[PDB]
Design a binder for this molecule. Sequence first.
Ligand SMILES: [Mn+2]
Ligand SMILES: [Mn+2]
Ligand SMILES: [Mn+2]
Lengths: 339, 339, 339
Amino acid sequence: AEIYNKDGNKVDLYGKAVGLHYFSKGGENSYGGNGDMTYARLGFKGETQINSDLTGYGQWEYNFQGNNSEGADAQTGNKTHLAFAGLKYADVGSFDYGRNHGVVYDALGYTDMLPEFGGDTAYSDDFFVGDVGGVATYRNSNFFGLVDGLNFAVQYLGKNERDTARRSNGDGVGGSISYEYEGFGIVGAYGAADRTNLQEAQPLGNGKKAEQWATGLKYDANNIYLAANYGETRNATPITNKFTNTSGFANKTQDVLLVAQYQFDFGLRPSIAYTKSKAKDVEGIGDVDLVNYFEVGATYYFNKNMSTYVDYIINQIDSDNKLGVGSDDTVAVGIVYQF
Amino acid sequence: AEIYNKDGNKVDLYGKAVGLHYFSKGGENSYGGNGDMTYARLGFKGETQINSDLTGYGQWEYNFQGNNSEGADAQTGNKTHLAFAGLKYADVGSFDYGRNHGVVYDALGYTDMLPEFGGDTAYSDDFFVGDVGGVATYRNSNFFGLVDGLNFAVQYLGKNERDTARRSNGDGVGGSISYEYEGFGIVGAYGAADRTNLQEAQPLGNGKKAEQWATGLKYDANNIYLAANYGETRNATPITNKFTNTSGFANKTQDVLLVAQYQFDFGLRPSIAYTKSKAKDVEGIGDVDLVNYFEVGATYYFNKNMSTYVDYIINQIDSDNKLGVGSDDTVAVGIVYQF
Amino acid sequence: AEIYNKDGNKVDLYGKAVGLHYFSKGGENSYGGNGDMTYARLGFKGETQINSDLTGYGQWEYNFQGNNSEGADAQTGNKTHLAFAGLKYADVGSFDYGRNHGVVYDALGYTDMLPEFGGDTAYSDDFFVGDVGGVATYRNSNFFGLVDGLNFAVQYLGKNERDTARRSNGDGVGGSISYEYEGFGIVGAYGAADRTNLQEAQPLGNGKKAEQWATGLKYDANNIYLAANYGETRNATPITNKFTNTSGFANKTQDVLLVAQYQFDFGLRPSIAYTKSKAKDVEGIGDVDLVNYFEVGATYYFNKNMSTYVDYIINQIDSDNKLGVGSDDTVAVGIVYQF
Ligand SMILES: [Mn+2]
Ligand SMILES: [Mn+2]
Ligand SMILES: [Mn+2]
């Protein structure tokens, strides 16, 4: 919804209301939980033509949970998703700064396409893999305008010394390179950052640097969407041990995500996917699967404003998992109005 | 404020800023309290024409309190009022899901018309009587298009197992039927739900099912608004005992609400009302009035964007009330800008 | 961004996304701190022409911090900046009520012009000097339309009995008078209010009334902005003692703020400023500087939507300060998209 378009400046207001319910047995031992998961999003996205070569931009988006009471829990799960501003010049590149996606998400975004679930390794506030505060990101499209389809990025992660180790990080650098051709896309991305003293002080995890990288392929054409990600992390993936009630990072993980989807012209978009994340070298445990499931699902698009969906997670995690990770299935049912 | 209207999709942004002050003696023993009560609302309401018979819709509304400091109390009273999405077909009905009004509010809305106060039994997060998370609601207008003025609804309340008993509920079903003719409206509505284990574990209240029903009449025509509600609840109305510092639900209540109002063409709308809510079978007490007052008030509408109002509550609750319910009067003064 | 303009009613939606980073040594002993300071603003401002002499209005603005994780700290620093509604008549005056600027801010606003910092004595939730809840404000423009450039205001501060003494206040009255001529402006403003029992009970500070006043001059013309404020407070300025971990108000302060700025036509706006705030009669200390710095800074305006800035605070506070006030420098770097 364009609310302003005079000369230089264009502003869009956008939002959505998501009626959403999760069904699981009982559901504290399930993949996704059980009960109402309704939420809403509001945001703006703006762009100003400063001169013939230079554009300025900003974006903001907030999440308002709709599954809280109006009492003490009213704000649970509310947060800023995105908040950044930047500048883009000609065929030189773009620079933005704020709360934005980590550069490894350039790869992980390939498989973050499921109706409701998926994208399990793109954790928020986790270095370079998901949403993260205080990133400066340089992006180049079409390699200075010389090589069509060839993009790269360089990202500096500023340190965020927060109260919890889960949500903190030290200074870091990361980058990504991407090539797209005839409906395919190839991507690789890598970042390394320091860990904070509060992260080192955690039982689970040990080392001075956190590292994350991932590669991916996608195909996105002729009504088909197929993608695969591979990734490895060092001291970056957050974990909990529900037996020892302790927490930290995984010394190492290996991550695989696959998705295949077809879009029928009358609106139905079935989805199948697989996701497997395994950790290693975990103080008091050894090797343990963090995520392991098959997904079968569908979205029905009535048009670009209205959709409904069912997302079924066949959870392959075992009831004996050493970290306590839930092993039951979850199915989501969603109805979405957006503008 | 329509911010988009192209072909299928219409989106309205709406909001208001309410400068509001409550005057009571001292005011911890008063009906409404004392001090600044300023707040603001923002929302969106959208509608998409999917085909000739089928429309999609969404609505979201948030409350931002304006009577908090910017310190630790900044978010007190902030919350999502509404957040839902749905579909409406032809002369078959509508279905929506999310945070929405309980179906008994179809009746109680009849008397929830006072400038500031009123609607005292339409508690939020209380089964079917007010705002509630995780409801699916089927609505039929004009009985499949066969009987003009005859509407009904069926609502399934999904369970919300929250940290407090006050804000929780179990699975439930409810319905309402309504008939309107020559400026009158007749309504009845009933819902029953299970209570959670955390609700059963509360001192005040006992039983496995919560029930709420209400009937109402209104007249709304020739510049007059007159309405009456009657209702009864079992194990549903929340209560506190300020002597024993305990809390729970009332085993039973009986509720009466009356309102009469006249709208002068130059803008003044005087209001008088009566509200009485009495509980029964309360562990350690017996019978006790929850609400008991006369209201005299007026709104002045300058136009549809700007209004001012005074709302006087003559509180008939006694200083000896057994639950500690406040007995002093309260008067509100409000100035409202909305769009 | 005007989202509605039909006949009587005009509504603007406004907002901004501020990518912002503070650099200080380490930075718990610095002026501004260290790390990401990204935030966003959203608001609306509306105005209705009720008749030829009478206009109605409302404004709301919220601050959403973008430097929080999505965990427990998600809402830190979020708040309502402004929330009020009012009426303006002909050449009689305006009246509004809500969360608005204290009338002493009529003076202090003169020097609150720095790219990022500055305006250090316009504390929020501090009687009349900054943002404050529950104020009713009468304003007269051009002295009933008789004396061009001559404005005054009268403000009644309603009592806000909050959980902390820092954020509370008692009933109070304040006023301001202002004269503008040939690019100059002269202002004086005074307010006095009662303190609450919780404020009296604080170690630092003693007395039954809080008082704040300030005068100022500005020049704002020919691309130059020059301003000076002087102010004195009694029992109003909040203070902390980081040695004794105690808090309260200063028995007295004296405040000086100066700013000079030049706006080049191609967009660069350099700024220099000085700010000094000194307290007196502080239980267990005597005299101590609260603020003391030089500022050198610049904004580059690409256009009215996009800007960038650097703001350098040369902090003159000493490492031995008796209240523990930080003594290190801070520099901010900001990139701003607004509409
Ligand atoms: Mn994201
Ligand atoms: Mn409601
Ligand atoms: Mn302000």
